[PDB]
Every structure is written in C-alpha cells, then in structure tokens.
C-alpha cells in the first residue's frame, strides 16, 4: 500500500512543538524521490541515508512527526543540536536515521495581530531524551517556595505562545516541520 | 532572600585565567536561565554567556573558545572560567537570572571588576600646578601610578568647597593619571597655604606636596 | 545582531517634570523589550518588561510603551532619585542572547554656565624626568558638551591630549573638564606658545587661555 503522506504534509492544522504529533505508518511504499524535487520544501536534510535511495530500502514502521516552530529554530531539528526547541520540545538522537523537512508557513499560520495558538516549552529542569514528548503544564518552580499551581514570582507557566504575525521576520515566521524516522 | 553575591575579580595579566563566582540565594541556579553580562568602563552592556537549566551552554562570538560557564548545584553558585584574556575583557562582570517574557532580567549581581594589564604597582608622581595671572585656581597632578585608586584631599580635608578631583585616565603607557584642582579667592594666596594629600594604598605611597606660584 | 538605538544620549530634566526616553530596534522585536535604571556604582534595576509591564516594586510614575521597532520609557514626574543611566534591552533573541541600547543619561537641568578656563604649564620637577604635561582646566560649566582644542603655535593638536569630565556637582550641578597635553621634554622646547581653545554654549566666542614658555 501507499504511504498516506498527504494527511501529514497537507494537514490543515499542525500541532505545537511542545506537543508534537506522531503518525505511525505501517510498512508502505512511497516515491520519496518525488518529495525531494518538490519546490514546496525549503529545508530537506537526510541523515544516515540518501533521499533518492529511500525507496530502495524497507522497514517495519516509518514515523511522521509534525509541529510548527519559528524560522530561526529550524536549525535545531538536527542531530547534536541544542536550544530551546532541541532541549525542551523536540530532540533528535545523535545517531538519527531519517530526514528533516521544513517549509515556510507564513501564509498559513500567521494571523494579523498575532496567532498565539502555537506554543513552546520555555522552562524545564533538564533536557529531553531523544523522541520524548513533554506536555505537562505544571507551574515551573524556579525558587525554593512551591507554587500550588499559582502563577507569580518564581512560579511561571512553562509554556509560551509564538507571536506569528505576517510582518515578522523569516527567522520568526512560522515554519511547518515534518521528521521521518525509520524502524528496522 | 533574593541575592546574587559575586566574587573572584581582580588583576590578571593578558593571556592568563580568572574564574568568577556568583553565589545565589533564594534563586536556584540549576533551575533557571543564568547569564553573564559584562560592561566595559564607560560603554554599554554586553552579554557574554548563558547556561540552561538543562545544561546547555551558549557564548557570544567575542568570548567563544575562551570562556566557559559552569555551575555547582551543591553550593548553588554560578561560575565563569575566563581563559586567554586580553585588553578587551577588562570590564565589570554581572551575573543575572533571566526570565524572557516572564519577567525579563529581574535580578542582577552586584558586579565584580576584571582588570587585564601588565604592570606592577608603581607609585604616583605628584607635580604642582601653579596659578598664573576674577578668582584664581591651583591644583596637583597625580601622574604615572597603578592601580586604582588614589585619594587626594586638600589641607587634610579642611578644604572641601571648590575642590574638583577628576577621574583617572588610562594613558598609553599602561599607567594612570589623575588631576585634582581647587579654586580659591586670589586674595588668600600667600597667607593661606595649600597642600594636597595624595595617598596610594596599593603601592603604600603617601605624599604631601606644596603648591605656590612661581 | 539586532541594534538598539536610544535617543537622546543625555536628557536634562528638572525635578517634577516629565522625562521621555526612546529606544529604536533595527529589526522587529514585537513586545520583547525591557527597560533598566542603573545608578553610578550600582547594578542595573529592572523597570519595565514586555514593553509596558512594570516590574514589582517600581513606582507608578514609570511607564513603558511601543512595539515592533519603536519603544518609549516615560517618567511622569521625575524625582531626585530617578537621575541615572537608563538602558533598553531587546530579548527577542533570548533563546540564546540579547542586546542593550547604548544608554540614556538623565541629569538635573540647570541654566547655561560658562566655564572658567585655567592653563597650567609643566612643573620643573617633571621636566627633569623627560616628559612635559600641559594641563587645561574647564571649571563649573553647563551643559557637558564642551570642545577643547589644543593649539601649539596655532597648530591644532590631535592625538596628543586626554580629557576627563566629572559627575554633576551636588550643589551647582555643573561639570568640570580636565584635558592633559603630554609630550616629550625634547618636543616641548621645539615650540613656544601653548594655548587651549574652549568652545561652549555659554560662550559667545571661543575663549583661549595661553602662555609663553618662560614668562
Ligand atoms: C498536497 O496537495 C497538492 C494538491 O492539492 C499536491 O500537489 C501536493 O503534492 C500535496 N502534497 C503532498 C506532500 O502530498
């Protein structure tokens, strides 16, 4: 059977990076050589495998992760990277085997006056394990005084909303990301 | 309480090493974004480095490969290891907790000064400034000394009104140069004696110089 | 980096009046901007964050506004404790870094005051060492903007002097300038007339105080 990639890339709404979606696909066939030469993708970097020879390999399941970040944070979706996204939102392994696809979505995810639906994790006591998802909204205890779920001093909501306006810079404009990882 | 007490600053030869400390109170270093900000004397503020609560470290392009930020959760103290120092790195270094859009950079350290130079503690040289031809003015010249500071008073502190002690200037010879003047009525010139009292605690130099016209 | 430009560099205001400070970003920083007050010899203190939110414990006379590339700090009624340096800071690049403005100095306003210019030739105890330091003094003037031109036989001296300004005085709120012209003893006798031109707002014409070597 064919890989339902149209439901992932051409999806109308993407998830926030702190709650990145994952689509588990069950051993299908797809023309990966068609997706590479598509001008819709401004970022397409594969690690451990070449984009053209993907149709020449087999696997048990291919995982399709999807989220939205700003332009400057696209460089973090790569093995051995650090930052607010790579540490507290989405982390790829150092030995990552797959591809990183991204495209500008200012015409889709930016609203005049700001689209604040997409969020990211700003505070976390430790970095994320590879392919880990942290969706907890517990109040971040920055000091020694506990918070009791009440925002205030030394008590911060661990998430912050992206300010996606059409007039923002490309590094701050929304970029939809899709990561393909394989399982042998 | 909420406190960021610093230590570790001082004089360091260009190229050497120096480690700064930032003891934290009430604020947990291992749970916050902790940065290092330096301010060149007479210039703006410059961000140097930053460590994440998760252990990630980032540095500015002007200190990359030479500086190293670290922390100790047991002592709850932020650190900054400075290697290969030059005349650039001479500044007052601050440590602060950052909150971004949730409170900006609210709490700062009191600041510790880092001076990078290659000169021993040379004693000053006090030269008089005699008045020439409404009111007159005279003063002393404290030249070629190191390091800061030097305390200059007139008549052992008995002459307060009309005195201006200028800040030192770092001349190209590595040493400092300070000026201290005082305007007095032209009448009481031969009757009232004027003696500037220059003290240099680093070099242990105390000199009293008489000022009188030619 | 995103460049932050504050205007004016110095703001002379009387107590009780309103002080307005601007800060322009080279690129859009949305509302990610903070304001700080720094008194001499003290660490900075946060006043405004999020372009407009007052920090805890900051008096109501402080208020911030603006977005994207233009921001403003307003002190509705300036108090004696508010005279200090003020810095803006963008943190839209906070995921790693952040940039500050060059700073705005808020100082007590007063009437224009002309400087009393004095010139001091080098002492004899110094000439025996090999250097000759000519000193020119500008005392109790306002504003701080004052140009000192060193003329040696009516030849402008560049790269030869170092100036030094004091803080505002506690009673008259004026400044004092100290420019020092240092040169070798050998080059001290190659010339004759050592002058010191002074241009200031409180001077209808540039005032010059000179002397002759040996008079
Ligand atoms: C999305 O749909 C368009 C047609 O509406 C198609 O040309 C494009 O290839 C699709 N994208 C993917 C990734 O299949």
> Is C4-108's fold the same as C116-212's?
yes
Buried b (16+ CB within 10 A) or exposed e, A69-86: bbbbbbbbbebebbbbbb
Distance of residue A118 Cα from the nearest chain C Cα, in angstroms? 16
CB atoms within 10 A of CB C177: 23
Substitution candidate for ligand 1 out of A4, A6, A8, A25 with most atoms within 8 A of CB: A6
Identify the residue among B4, B30, B31 best suited for mutation to test binding to A, counting A beta carbons within 10 A and taking the highest: B31
Residue closest to A126 by CA, chosen among B51, B36, B47: B51
B125-211: which CATH topology?
Immunoglobulin-like (2.60.40)
Cβ atoms A127, A76 nearer than 8 A: no
Total length of chain A = 184
Instruction: Name all residues whose Cβ lies below 6 A of ligand 1.
Output: A 5-6, 9-10
- Those residues of chain C whose CB sits closer than 8 Å to some CB in chain A are 27-28, 30-31, 56, 68, 92, 95-96
Give Cα B51 distance to the centre of its chain. Answer: 26
- Give the number of beta-carbon pairs within 8 Å between B and C: 127
Q: Does CATH number 3.10.129.10 belong to domain C116-212?
A: no
- Those residues of chain A whose CB sits closer than 8 Å to some CB in chain C are 72-73, 83-84, 153, 163, 165, 167-169, 172
Give chain C's end-to-end CA distance (angstroms, integer). 57
A6-183: which CATH topology?
Alpha-Beta Plaits (3.30.70)
Contact partners for chain C, using 3 or more CB pairs closer than 8 A, are A, B
CA distance C214 to B118: 38
Handedness of CA C108, C113, C114, C115 (dihedral sign): negative
- What resolution (Å)? 3.3
List the domain boundaries for chain C: 4-108, 116-212
CA distance A174 to A134: 21
Beta bridge partners of B25: B3
Distance of residue A109 Cα from the nearest chain B Cα, in angstroms? 21
* Residues sharing a CB contact under 8 Å with residue B58, sequence separation 6 or more, in sequence order: A82, B49, B50, B51, C96, C97
CA distance C211 to B74: 67
CA distance C162 to C167: 17
CA distance A79 to A73: 13
CA distance C87 to C4: 10
CA distance B113 to B7: 9
CB-based contact A142 B27, cutoff 8 Å: yes
Total length of chain C = 215
Residue closest to C30 by CA, chosen among B34, A106, A16, A173: A173
* Residues sharing a CB contact under 8 Å with residue B162, sequence separation 6 or more, in sequence order: B182, B183, B184
Residue closest to A118 by CA, chosen among A64, A163, A74, A73: A163
Handedness of CA B32, B38, B42, B45 (dihedral sign): negative
Q: Does CATH number 2.60.40.10 belong to domain C4-108?
A: yes
C contacts of A165 (beta carbons < 8 Å): 30
Q: Which two tokens stand for residue B104?
A: 């900006």
CA distance B93 to B97: 14
C contacts of B45 (beta carbons < 8 Å): 44, 87, 89, 100
Distance of residue A140 Cα from the nearest chain C Cα, in angstroms? 18
DSSP assignment string, A130-145: TT------PPEE-BSS
C contacts of A169 (beta carbons < 8 Å): 27-28
C contacts of A172 (beta carbons < 8 Å): 28, 92
**CATH numeric code, B3-116:** 2.60.40.10
Buried b (16+ CB within 10 A) or exposed e, B188-200: eeeeeebebbbbb
Give chain A's end-to-end CA distance (angstroms, integer). 18
Distance of residue B12 Cα from the nearest chain C Cα, in angstroms? 22
List the domain boundaries for chain A: 6-183
Q: Which two tokens stand for residue B128?
A: 């008089």
Which residue's CA is the closest to the ligand 1 atom numbered 3?
A: A10
CA distance B192 to B159: 11
H-type alpha helices, C119-160: 124-127
CA distance B94 to B44: 13
List the domain boundaries for chain B: 3-116, 125-211
**CA distances to B135, B149, C83 from C34, in Å:** 49, 34, 18
CA distance C41 to B148: 15
């Amino acid at each position: 059977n064919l890989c339902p990639f149209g439901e992932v890339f051409n999806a109308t709404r993407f998830a926030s990076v702190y709650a990145w979606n994952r689509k588990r696909i069950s051993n299908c066939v797809a023309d990966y050589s068609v997706l590479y030469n598509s001008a819709s993708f401004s970022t397409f970097k594969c690690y451990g495998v070449s984009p053209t020879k993907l149709n020449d390999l087999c696997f048990t399941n291919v995982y399709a992760d999807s989220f939205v970040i700003r332009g400057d944070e696209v460089r973090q979706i790569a093995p051995g990277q650090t930052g607010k996204i790579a540490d507290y939102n989405y982390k790829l392994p150092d030995d990552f085997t797959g591809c990183v696809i991204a495209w500008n979505s200012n015409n889709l995810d930016s609203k005049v006056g700001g689209n604040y639906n997409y969020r990211y994790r700003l505070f976390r006591k430790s970095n994320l394990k590879p392919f880990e998802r942290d969706i907890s909204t517990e109040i971040y205890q920055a000091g020694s005084k506990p918070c009791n779920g009440v925002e205030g001093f030394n008590c911060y909501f661990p998430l912050q909303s992206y300010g996606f306006q059409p007039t923002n810079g490309v590094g701050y404009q929304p970029y939809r990301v899709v990561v393909l990882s394989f399982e042998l | 309480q909420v406190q960021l007490q610093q230590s570790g600053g001082g004089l360091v030869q260009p190229g050497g090493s120096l480690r700064l400390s930032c003891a934290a109170s009430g604020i947990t270093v291992s749970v916050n974004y902790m940065s290092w900000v330096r301010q060149a004397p007479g210039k703006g503020l410059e961000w140097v480095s930053l460590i994440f609560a998760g252990g990630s470290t980032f540095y500015a392009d002007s200190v990359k490969g030479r500086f190293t930020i670290s922390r100790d959760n047991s002592k709850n103290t932020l650190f900054l290891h400075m290697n290969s120092l030059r005349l650039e790195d001479t500044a007052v270094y601050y440590c602060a907790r950052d909150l971004g859009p949730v409170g900006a950079t609210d709490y700062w350290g009191q600041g510790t000064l880092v001076t990078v130079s290659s000169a021993s503690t040379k004693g000053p040289s006090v030269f008089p400034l005699a008045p020439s031809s409404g009111t007159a003015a005279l003063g002393c010249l404290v030249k070629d000394y190191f390091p800061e500071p030097v305390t200059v008073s007139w008549n052992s502190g008995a002459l307060t009104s009309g005195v201006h002690t200028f800040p030192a200037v770092l001349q190209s010879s590595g040493l400092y140069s300070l000026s201290s003047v005082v305007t007095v009525p032209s009448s009481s010139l031969g009757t009232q004696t004027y003696i500037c009292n220059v003290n240099h605690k680093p070099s242990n130099t105390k000199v009293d110089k008489r000022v009188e016209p030619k | 980096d995103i460049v932050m430009t504050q205007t004016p560099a110095t703001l002379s205001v009387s107590p009780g009046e309103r002080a307005t400070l601007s800060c322009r970003a080279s690129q859009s920083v949305s509302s990610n901007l903070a304001w700080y007050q720094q008194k001499p010899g003290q660490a900075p203190r946060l006043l405004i964050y999020g372009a407009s939110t007052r920090a805890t414990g900051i008096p109501a006379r402080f208020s911030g506004s603006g977005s994207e590339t233009e921001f403003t700090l307003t002190i509705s009624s300036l108090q004696s404790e508010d005279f200090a340096l003020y810095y803006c800071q963008q943190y839209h690049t906070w995921p790693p870094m952040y940039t500050f403005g060059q700073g705005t100095k808020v100082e007590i306003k007063r009437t224009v005051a002309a400087p009393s210019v004095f010139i001091f030739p080098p002492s004899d105890e110094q000439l025996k060492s090999g250097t000759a330091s000519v000193v020119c003094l500008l005392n109790n003037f306002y504003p701080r903007e004052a140009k000192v031109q060193w003329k040696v036989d009516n030849a402008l001296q560049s790269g030869n002097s170092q100036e030094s300004v004091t803080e505002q005085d506690s009673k008259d709120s004026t400044y004092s300038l100290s420019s020092t012209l240092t040169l070798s003893k050998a080059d001290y006798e190659k010339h004759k007339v050592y002058a010191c031109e002074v241009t200031h707002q409180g001077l209808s014409s540039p005032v010059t105080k000179s002397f002759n070597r040996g008079e």
